[PDB]
From a paper:
In this study, we report a detailed characterization of ΦCjT23, an icosahedral temperate ssDNA phage with an inner lipid membrane, isolated earlier from a strain of Flavobacterium (previously Cytophaga). The virion structure determined by cryogenic electron microscopy reveals similarities to members of the viral kingdom Bamfordvirae that currently consists solely of dsDNA viruses with a major capsid protein composed of two upright β-sandwiches. The minimalistic structure of ΦCjT23 suggests that this phage serves as a model for the last common ancestor between ssDNA and dsDNA viruses in the Bamfordvirae. Both ΦCjT23 and the related phage FLiP infect Flavobacterium species found in several environments, suggesting that these types of viruses have a global distribution and a shared evolutionary origin.
Earlier, we reported a phylogenetic connection between phage PM2 and the ssDNA phage FLiP (Finnlakevirus FLiP, Finnlakeviridae), which infects flavobacteria. Structurally, however, the two share the same capsid organization, characterized by the triangulation (T) number pseudo T = 21 dextro. Following the approach applied to the MCPs, we calculated a localized reconstruction of the internal part of ΦCjT23 spike (penton domain), in addition to the FLiP penton base from our previously published data. The resolutions of the localized reconstructions for ΦCjT23 and FLiP were 3.4 and 4.0 Å, respectively. This was sufficient to build the corresponding atomic models de novo. As expected, the structure of the FLiP penton revealed a pentamer formed by five copies of protein P12 (encoded by orf12) with the canonical β-sandwich fold, similar to penton base proteins of PM2 and PRD1. This confirmed that the FLiP spike is formed by a separate protein forming a pentamer sitting atop the capsid integral penton base.
Author numbering: -2 to 144
Write the structure that this text describes.
């Protein structure tokens, strides 16, 4: 072997495993010095006691992000929720991180409450916009890649 910490060409061929992620980055994300990766998890929220953005920089996240919005029984303001997510899927072509936003528009009648799981491969997670009436929670279950 005598390669870097990531290991390629392993018989483990499954989309959810970190092996698929490593094999994909070593093949279609050249000019990126991939260092050791570890299974990581973190949570961002809207209420006090949590951070609105990831402190890490120049580190690629791969895994499933769980969006969660619930009502806190508070007066409404008629704003919108915006969660801007970077995207390195097309980073090689343009040498930039694509910006993707997941938005649920808030009505005074449509009393929204839903939770869902999505797959993303991003750099940083930021809650650019927020509504004080609701509760927002995002959880990441995947792997962190150091560059």
């Amino acid at each position: 072997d005598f390669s870097t910490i990531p290991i390629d060409y392993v018989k483990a061929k499954d989309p959810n495993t970190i092996d698929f992620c490593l094999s994909y980055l070593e093949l279609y994300h050249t000019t990126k010095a991939v260092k050791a990766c570890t299974p990581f998890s973190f949570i961002l929220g809207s209420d006090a006691g949590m951070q609105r953005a990831t402190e890490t920089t120049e580190s690629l996240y791969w895994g499933k992000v769980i969006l969660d919005i619930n009502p806190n029984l508070s007066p409404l303001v008629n704003t919108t929720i915006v969660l801007e997510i970077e995207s390195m899927l097309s980073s090689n072509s343009i040498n930039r991180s694509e910006n993707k936003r997941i938005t649920r528009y808030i009505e005074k009648e449509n009393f929204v409450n839903e939770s869902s799981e999505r797959f993303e491969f991003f750099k940083s997670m930021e809650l650019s916009h927020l509504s004080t009436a609701y509760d927002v929670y995002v959880t990441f279950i995947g792997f962190k890649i150091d560059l």
